[PDB]
Design a protein around this ligand. Structure first.
Ligand SMILES: COCC(=O)Nc1ccc(O)c(-c2cc(C(=O)O)ccn2)c1
Ligand SMILES: [Mn+2]
Ligand SMILES: [Zn+2]
Length: 351
């Protein structure tokens, strides 16, 4: 059944009606019944009727406490990105820098032109990414796809333990400018993520199907043996950029998609993604889960070289949703193998 859904594992795009759109978990379950998860990435375009905020003309005073200057080093489609923390600044200050002649978007015809220019000039004139800003731009009453309160089973973390993990069970805002990037990664604990582009120039994405994720890891370990020996999951450092031409060259399947203002991106468990911003923009994002994620969570290989890293206790999820397996899991004998093609069980509604 599942094997025959989206057998190309291409990035799918969905256009829900407002009735479909009102229930978040249900629609995620729906797109999985359509095999969307196999791509590792899906676009969801909300009804034109819908808006999370009436106006963004009131945010110029919003502070970006830790802007990041992105210094990229490398050649031949392989790069390492170093973060240089800069002093706090306001959205208006950032926009000014972003739109200045030094940092603004280059002129171009088709997207393929801008893409070529990104991968040619990535290491020159390091931009500033106003990333990881704690907050939401959703109005308090918006009940559909509210990144602040999505109500998935990831809520069980805070519920059981009181722990908040910034950007994971709370929202992050990202203010981008041209040539700012996010390196190849999956989410913390191999969770889902949701990304909403509030406004501005587009954000382009690359994705590797979860069922081919290990091949990407193998390639990465080969190009960075030093990093691979120092850490069991060095891609979680989110410093590694790899061009689509390199991926092609080594037979890693991947897809590309460009996200525009007003559009959602969903990433799926163990879906590697990377990309860049076209120009000044603003994205909001957080992580979430489904019953399917639990096994990914149990098997996630985490960064072994930093103490700062995100780790969620799987115990409560296994007790509540896999009680028959808890003793086996705790005794280290749970050898369940993940089928990346299966949809989450909540999808059984749509079969
Ligand atoms: C050192 O690098 C920090 C980083 O990339 N953090 C991070 C951690 C998890 C993520 O899901 C994203 C992220 C960022 C973007 C984006 O910048 O828009 C798109 C998709 N994912 C970014
Ligand atoms: Mn991500
Ligand atoms: Zn590490």
């Amino acid at each position: 059944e599942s094997e025959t859904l989206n057998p190309s594992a291409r990035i799918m795009t969905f256009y829900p009606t407002m009735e479909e759109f009102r229930n978040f978990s249900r629609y995620i379950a729906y797109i999985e019944s359509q095999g969307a998860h196999r791509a590792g990435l899906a676009k969801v375009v909300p009804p034109k009727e819908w808006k999370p905020r009436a106006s963004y003309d009131d945010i110029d005073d919003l502070v970006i406490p830790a802007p990041i200057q992105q210094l990229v080093t490398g050649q031949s489609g392989l790069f390492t990105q170093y973060n240089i923390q800069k002093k706090a600044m306001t959205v208006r200050e950032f926009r000014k820098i972003a739109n200045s002649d030094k940092y603004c978007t280059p002129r171009y015809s088709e997207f393929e032109e801008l893409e070529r220019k990104y991968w040619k000039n990535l290491t020159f004139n390091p931009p500033i990414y106003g990333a990881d800003v704690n907050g939401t731009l959703y109005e308090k009453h918006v009940d559909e796809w509210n990144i602040g309160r999505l109500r998935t089973i990831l809520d069980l973390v805070e519920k059981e333990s009181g722990i908040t993990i910034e950007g994971v069970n709370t929202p992050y805002l990202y203010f981008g400018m041209w040539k700012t990037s996010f390196a190849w990664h999956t989410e913390d604990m191999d969770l889902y993520s949701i990304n909403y582009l509030h406004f501005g120039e587009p954000k382009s994405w690359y994705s590797v199907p979860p069922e081919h994720g290990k091949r990407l890891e193998r390639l990465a370990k080969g190009f960075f043996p030093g990093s691979a020996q120092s850490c069991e999951a060095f891609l979680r450092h989110k410093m590694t950029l790899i061009s689509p031409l390199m991926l092609k060259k080594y037979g890693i399947p991947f897809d590309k998609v460009t996200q525009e203002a007003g559009e959602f991106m969903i990433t799926f468990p163990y879906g590697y993604h990377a990309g860049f911003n076209h120009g000044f923009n603003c994205a909001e994002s957080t992580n979430f889960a489904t019953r399917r994620w639990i096994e990914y969570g149990k098997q996630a290989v985490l960064c072994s070289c930093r103490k700062d890293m995100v780790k969620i206790s799987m115990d409560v999820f296994v007790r509540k949703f896999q009680p028959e397996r808890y003793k086996l899991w705790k005794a280290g004998k749970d050898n369940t193998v993940i089928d990346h093609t299966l949809p989450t069980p909540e999808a059984a509604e749509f079969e």
